[PDB]
């Protein structure tokens, strides 16, 4: 903007698990203001993963995001702490969209479970990005 340090916005923690990571992922899922639908999708996916394996919903999500997070992007440049999280959050929903399970919440839960083991489309995309990073 040529004259200001415009401050970063502060989004409220989610009303259920009180996690800003879940809040930001919810905002990434939301389209054109349909927060209720985005909330239903994400909260259903989390409940499904919890039922399948009994773990704290927040810990599993943070661990999976850590696996999915890119290191660098192409002269190669190191991305700042927020940009990696944004990229991982985007690619997770992108892969869940192309998944072919019944409902969006269920296929999001399936994608998260696959990424946790490492046999997931998002993890494969990260591997492809890493492979291309060797060009320079």
């Amino acid at each position: 903007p040529r004259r200001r340090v415009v401050a970063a916005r502060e989004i409220l923690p989610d009303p259920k698990f009180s996690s800003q990571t879940i809040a930001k992922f919810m905002n990434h899922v939301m389209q054109d203001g349909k927060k209720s639908i985005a909330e239903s999708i994400v909260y259903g996916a989390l409940e499904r993963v919890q039922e399948k394996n009994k773990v704290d919903p927040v810990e599993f999500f943070e661990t999976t995001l850590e696996k999915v997070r890119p290191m660098v992007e192409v002269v190669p440049m190191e991305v700042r702490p927020s940009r990696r999280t944004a990229l991982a959050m985007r690619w997770l929903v992108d892969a869940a969209a192309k998944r072919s399970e019944k409902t969006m919440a269920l296929r999001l839960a399936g994608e998260l479970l696959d990424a946790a083991e490492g046999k997931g489309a998002a993890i494969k995309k990260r591997e492809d990005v890493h492979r291309m990073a060797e060009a320079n």
């Binding site: 009303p15 259920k16 209720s36 909330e39």
Partner: protein, 126 residues
């Protein structure tokens, strides 16, 4: 016994708070009947949830105007103000939480020559 008035985006809420067991009535309805969005219920419950006083009070609330989110915010502001009226020593923690502030954001008016408040018609040089 104590009273509070809450406002958020054209929604106004009248909250009467008395020492009780935990009943909560909105517009002669019950919380789950009035709000079908669980997030709205949790937003409403935040104040007493913070103070661990859910079972120490009863709530009789009327609300008018706005939409679902606006009415939920107005009810939360009203409950906060009623708690302040009941006791002043609570106000520090409530302010730290952020429930004291009256959110002043409102819709911006549409402007002549524009499609919306800020959105502009598509431009072409040739």
């Amino acid at each position: 016994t104590n009273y509070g008035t809450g406002r958020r985006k054209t929604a106004t809420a009248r909250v009467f708070l008395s020492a009780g067991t935990g009943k909560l009535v909105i517009n002669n309805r019950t919380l789950e009947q009035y709000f079908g969005r669980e997030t709205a219920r949790m937003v409403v419950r935040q104040p007493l949830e913070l103070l661990e006083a859910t079972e120490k009070y009863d709530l009789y609330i009327t609300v008018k105007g706005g939409g679902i989110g606006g009415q939920a915010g107005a009810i939360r502001h009203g409950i906060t103000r009623a708690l302040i009226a009941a006791d002043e020593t609570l106000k520090p923690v409530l302010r730290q939480a952020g429930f004291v502030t009256r959110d002043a954001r409102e819709v911006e008016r549409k402007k002549l020559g524009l499609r919306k408040a800020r959105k502009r018609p598509q431009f072409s040089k040739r």
